[PDB]
């Protein structure tokens, strides 16, 4: 996942 | 791990350890096993009791109600385009009959809602797809007085609007009784009369009954208009316990239920002829 | 949140622990399925509730 | 393609759900909230302000200023009651229409303690002592001082502090009770006798109003959300 | 020891003080007390007045008689001031304006006397109307000025349908809109019971769901005074005592100055 | 943790603290607890408030709308092919009197709708599924002149295309209001008359309303042509204040409301009778 | 839009299923347990206690 | 971007913290359901909204 | 067969909805942008450039 | 793959960073639904393209 | 961080500084904003261009 | 993930 | 998750  | 206890070898015996003899007036089972009185072999028992647990004895929706509900013009005389259900397992036998092994029960209930609609005249046209409100009324709410009266607005009530042809409705409820458990036996009254009671009435009451109102209603009515064919429609109402602790193990009914209560009038006679001395 | 436990397997294929996975959508614990990972008990307060409970090869009566 | 198999309850609409769904205007600017003073957080938050209680709801009383009023006066009849009224706090029609009885009336079950506060507004040259009672359900509703004094009460002395404040305890059988009458879940009694008498000197008023104010306590809750019977439309 | 009591208080705004010696405590509404619009919560851009002094001071509105059938009294916020001194010209020169007040009730009887004022401030204080049209008050009518308005004990609806009165019917039990007179407790309030004290004092903060608005289109506060027992006095059938109202401003704030507003009220 | 506080043990008391005396003349409730003036045993406190919250008294989607409207030939008389209306929850009663226990709220709006139809004429043959097609129109938008002009393109306006039969559409709304929250009381006017208007009728206007077309209407058609049968059709709207903070309470409303201010009318008299000392 | 297919057994009720389901009384205040004697946990401890049997099952 | 939290566990089968989990799908906060994890407050600003709040134990006119 | 049971909003068209679809032209190959004088990011930078108004909208 | 970003949050619940989740299901970009985390620029190009900009305190016409 | 720019608070002005001179022949657009041409209070300024993005 |  |  990546978060921002 | 869960099966049952293995069964251990035992050989001849000869001794004052006499486990055969026992005295049932103590209120005691003598808690024997094959190989205090006959000589066994070891078993390895894989055998277990997943099936009887209170909460796999219970699992399954059992039909407690079918409700009828029309939809045709509202004429002026008695009609069903609303219908309206007291919530009680006593309408039925079958799922009564197993919460009563028990005096006290607590769990969650699952409700799954069939409903099936046929016509009933030959032909007056026909019908698009109907929608059904199954609105829950607690004690003290106002009860509708028509099927489209303000009541069915539902602001705090809460309402499942059913489609024809969908899966069947579901909803689950929690531990929802006053007391710390239900009673499924209730040995009392809800009033006393008193002596400087004015007459009789004033404190009398059923019998082993406790709330007038108990849990309150389902309302149930078809929300579209009618159409110029009548259809008549059933609800049907299956109640699954889940999340169940039982308390207080009693005898199960073993004749006719005759009402709410443990009442009895015919059928008295539950045992067949045998002979003694036959097998 | 995801639950992991294993299944009690009965009938086995031609290929060991089998598992299956549980997530709860619901905030209150009445919308939850049962586990059925139940336990038992002991039914001693039923079959013996005496109060000095007697070894099954004495008397009970003594 | 993830395979999936649709339960029971598939496309039902149920009015209590909690279910996101698509919003109709994205990417609004939303205006800001301010400080507003007088913010409430639980509905339980209002049953605990005291309100006026209708206490006087003979024939011609009732629906006028006059049904908050209860007349005390130097020539009563000592051993009658001044007022009766049942601890049923949604439904007695003394009850029912104060806020404590508003947010009642939208749950079916209510528990906790309440209290009780009576003003005094004679004059001051008034005095009297008073004895407020809540006999706990089950036998006979007090007719008599001789009867009240056995259950909970206060011995009122009207002075400077002009107000006397009654707690009823929750003392109950089952562990909510309905807000619908009921005798499985009955309250009890409360019940206002004199002590001794109002006593004026002359140049004085003889008669005066007594006016009575209902509040939860701390402990009080409510549960499982009903619609109320005190609102209605007609087709 | 010295001698402090919550009976006895000093008001001092501006050039105005205010003493009573028979005081039950003093309300703070919804526990805030006034403030100017911080900078955060600001709206329009233009640098307001804050006239201070000149405004934020004790105005004495005309006094009315308390008699035994009376049913009570109602006043509007900013309305009841709109005619006060430099409060009144910054409220009209001003599109916008912002203001929370102290007001002070007073009424004194004797050791002999009884009854009892309920004083209960109300945000958003919507009145009901005289006849069979809905929202039809109108402007000049729903604002009295410094008079205020009385309640009545029933409602009298407007019949000449061809001249309609357009004014408030506020029945008395049902708090002049609707609802039941008993539950007004739950409104920041104060009571009067002449054998206890002779005034009620509550601070006032600006409430509304803006951080300023039009004060000449919108009241914020209403205040309602109820004979909640009525007036009474040795056997005399006859009496009157006098109610006195003195309400100031506080942090009062205008923005966007332009001509003056002139209503019309006659 | 969100259980009510413990009741405390408290024993006999001879002194000079008196909770039991007050004066409610100074505007506040005596906070008093049973202990102060009974014996208390000491009870560990299980119950909550979690009911009670304001996002769970509001928590519920109740009706404030039922729009008709019909699928038939295009004639020239007046015709329900496609109804408007004006969002609100002032036309119908429950939810209204809720949320008026606040002077101000701010909230997101869940509307959920659910359309039933059926056949009013005994048979012209019958009619295939229909697609609705509900269309917000926002103050100053051009509204409908008929079925299907041209606004119906909804080139910007949001519109939900429902199809009979499906689950009941459902869409969220963030909080819109012009002001910092919503004001459910106004006492105020939208115009001022001043001294040099050239007549009365330019300052006036509608005590206690503010904007004129408030939040718009939503306008909705049947999106076929139509059958040779007519078909009649409801549009129930459901709404659910969620995300919910509310300011200022104010008394509930206790006599029947009498339009969208708070004027009253009839039935102004709510309280029954009941004798001073009957229990 | 995550793509889905669904399979044979779609829409049907068993009653022996185990699923969840919205809950229709949210965030409702359960009444505590307390400790009730007698609490069973199997079916078959009941079948362990010893009842009387019906032997004689003669006409009369 | 999964959030899990506790549930407050009414009827007990028997079988602890039942966990539920929550992913919001939507980038708009309005389309999100109702957390219903509510703190709640003092009454006081309503109930005792007093210049000078006095003890329950003394006079409340001195 | 994931269990699944479908909500309220099901199977509508909300014409602001914001959702992926399939791709009717898989694979193309798509014509880099270039760098196009005037670009526009904001409805809210033409609001901002001056035009004339129409002062005068009597009759001739 | 699952991408998690915050919501700007409008009305707010008694009850900090809301997320929401995405994951892209399709090859082609062009299936992907909008992310409308937009950003903006400077109008200059069509409020102030002159060749000397100059300052607005300073005259126009020098 | 979407937000438009906050107000600045601004006072009198008596001096060379003449914002609200300009000659639109040159094809520009005044840049000016309230404080220019009137005395504004400090605003912090929380709206944005959200829903006006292309 | 983040459990509360 | 949470395996038992
Ligand atoms: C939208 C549909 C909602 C349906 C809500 C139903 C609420 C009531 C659930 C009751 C379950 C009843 C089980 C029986 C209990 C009784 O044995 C005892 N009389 C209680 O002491
Ligand atoms: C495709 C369908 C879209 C539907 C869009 C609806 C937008 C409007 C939502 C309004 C929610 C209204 C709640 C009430 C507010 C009022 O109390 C006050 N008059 C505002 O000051
Ligand atoms: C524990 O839950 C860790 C994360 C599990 C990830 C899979 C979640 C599947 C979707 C659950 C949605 C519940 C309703 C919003
Ligand atoms: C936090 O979200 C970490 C990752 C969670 C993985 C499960 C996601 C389930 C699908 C969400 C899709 C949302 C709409 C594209
Ligand atoms: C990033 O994607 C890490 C893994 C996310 C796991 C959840 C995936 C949900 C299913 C996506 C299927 C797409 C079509 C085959």
Redesign the pocket.
């Known amino acids: 996942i990546s978060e921002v | 791990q869960d099966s049952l206890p293995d069964t251990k070898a035992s050989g001849p015996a000869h001794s004052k350890e006499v486990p055969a003899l026992t005295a049932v007036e103590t209120g005691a089972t003598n808690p024997l096993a094959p190989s205090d009185t006959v000589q066994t072999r070891h078993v390895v028992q894989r055998r277990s009791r997943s099936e009887s647990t209170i909460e796999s004895f219970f699992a399954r929706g059992a039909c407690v109600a079918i409700i009828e509900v029309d939809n045709e013009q509202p004429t002026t005389r008695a009609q069903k385009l609303f219908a309206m259900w007291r919530?009680?397992?006593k309408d039925t036998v079958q799922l009564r009959r197993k919460?009563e092994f028990f005096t006290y029960?607590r769990?969650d209930?699952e409700?799954t809602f069939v409903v099936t609609a046929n016509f009933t005249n030959a032909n007056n046209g026909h019908a698009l797809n109907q929608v059904y409100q199954?609105?829950?009324i607690?004690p003290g709410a106002p009860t509708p007085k028509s099927w489209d009266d303000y009541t069915w607005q539902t602001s705090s009530?809460?309402?499942?609007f059913y489609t024809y042809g969908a899966a069947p409705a579901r909803?689950s409820?929690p531990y929802?009784?006053?007391?710390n458990?239900?009673?499924?036996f209730?040995d009392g009254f809800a009033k006393v009369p008193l002596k400087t009671d004015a007459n009789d009435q004033i404190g009398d009451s059923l019998y082993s009954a406790?709330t007038v109102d108990?849990?309150?209603v389902?309302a149930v009515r078809v929300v579209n208009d009618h159409n110029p064919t009548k259809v008549t429609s059933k609800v049907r109402i299956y109640?699954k316990?889940k999340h169940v602790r039982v308390w207080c193990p009693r005898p199960p009914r073993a004749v006719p239920y005759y009402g709410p209560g443990v009442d009895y009038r015919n059928n008295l006679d539950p045992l067949s002829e045998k002979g003694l001395t036959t097998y | 949140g995801a639950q992991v436990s294993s299944q009690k397997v009965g009938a086995h294929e031609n290929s060991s622990t089998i598992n299956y996975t549980t997530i709860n959508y619901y905030k209150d614990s009445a919308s939850n399925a049962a586990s059925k990972q139940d336990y038992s008990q002991d039914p001693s307060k039923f079959t013996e509730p005496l109060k000095d409970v007697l070894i099954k090869t004495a008397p009970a009566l003594n | 393609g993830l395979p999936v198999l649709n339960t029971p309850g598939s496309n039902q609409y149920?009015?209590?759900d909690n279910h996101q769904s698509p919003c109709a205007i994205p990417e609004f600017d939303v205006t800001p909230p301010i400080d507003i003073p007088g913010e409430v957080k639980n509905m339980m938050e209002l049953a605990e302000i005291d309100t006026m209680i209708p206490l006087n709801l003979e024939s011609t009383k009732r629906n006028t200023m006059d049904m908050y009023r209860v007349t005390l006066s130097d020539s009563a009849d000592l051993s009658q009651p001044i007022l009766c009224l049942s601890l049923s706090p949604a439904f007695d029609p003394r009850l029912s229409h104060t806020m404590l009885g508003e947010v009642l009336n939208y749950y079916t079950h209510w528990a906790g303690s309440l209290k009780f506060t009576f003003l005094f507004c004679g004059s001051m040259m008034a005095t009297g002592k008073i004895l407020v009672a809540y006999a706990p359900p089950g036998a006979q509703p007090p007719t008599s001082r001789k009867e009240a004094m056995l259950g909970t009460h206060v011995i009122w002395d009207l002075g400077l502090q002009s107000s006397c404040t009654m707690v009823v305890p929750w003392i109950s059988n089952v562990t909510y009770r309905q807000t619908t009458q009921d005798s499985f879940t009955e309250g009890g009694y409360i019940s206002m006798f004199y002590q001794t008498r109002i006593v004026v000197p002359l140049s004085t008023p003889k008669s005066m109003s007594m006016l009575g104010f209902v509040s939860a306590c701390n402990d009080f809750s409510v549960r499982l959300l009903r619609d109320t019977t005190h609102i209605s439309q007609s087709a | 020891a010295c001698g402090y009591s919550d009976r006895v208080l000093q008001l001092t705004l501006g050039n105005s003080t205010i003493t009573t010696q028979e005081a039950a405590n003093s309300v703070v509404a919804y526990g805030r007390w006034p403030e100017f619009i911080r900078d955060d919560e600001a709206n329009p851009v233009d640098q307001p007045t804050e006239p201070d002094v000149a405004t934020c001071r004790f105005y004495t509105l005309d006094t009315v008689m308390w008699g035994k059938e009376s049913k009570g009294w109602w006043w509007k916020l900013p309305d009841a001031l709109r005619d006060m001194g430099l409060f009144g010209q910054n409220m009209y020169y001003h599109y916008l304006g912002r203001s929370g007040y102290t007001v002070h009730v007073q009424c004194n009887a004797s050791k002999f006397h009884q009854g009892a004022l309920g004083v209960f401030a109300i945000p958003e204080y919507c009145l009901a109307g005289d006849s069979d049209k809905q929202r039809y008050t109108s402007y000049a009518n729903a604002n009295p000025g410094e008079r205020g308005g009385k309640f009545y004990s029933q409602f009298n609806k407007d019949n000449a349908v061809t001249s309609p009165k357009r004014e408030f019917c506020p029945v008395d039990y049902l708090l002049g809109c609707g609802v039941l007179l008993g539950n007004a407790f739950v409104y920041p309030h104060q009571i009067i019971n002449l054998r206890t004290n002779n005034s009620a004092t509550i601070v006032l903060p600006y409430v509304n769901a803006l951080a300023i608005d039009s004060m000449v289109k919108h009241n914020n506060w209403g205040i309602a005074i109820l004979p909640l027992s009525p007036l009474d006095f040795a056997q005399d059938s006859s009496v009157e005592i006098p109610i006195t109202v003195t309400i100031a401003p506080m942090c009062s704030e205008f923005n966007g100055l332009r001509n003056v507003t002139a209503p019309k009220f006659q």
């Open positions: 919530i009680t397992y919460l029960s769990f209930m409700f199954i609105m829950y607690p009530n809460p309402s499942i909803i409820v929802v009784g006053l007391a458990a239900y009673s499924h209730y406790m108990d849990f309150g389902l109640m316990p | 149920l009015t209590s």
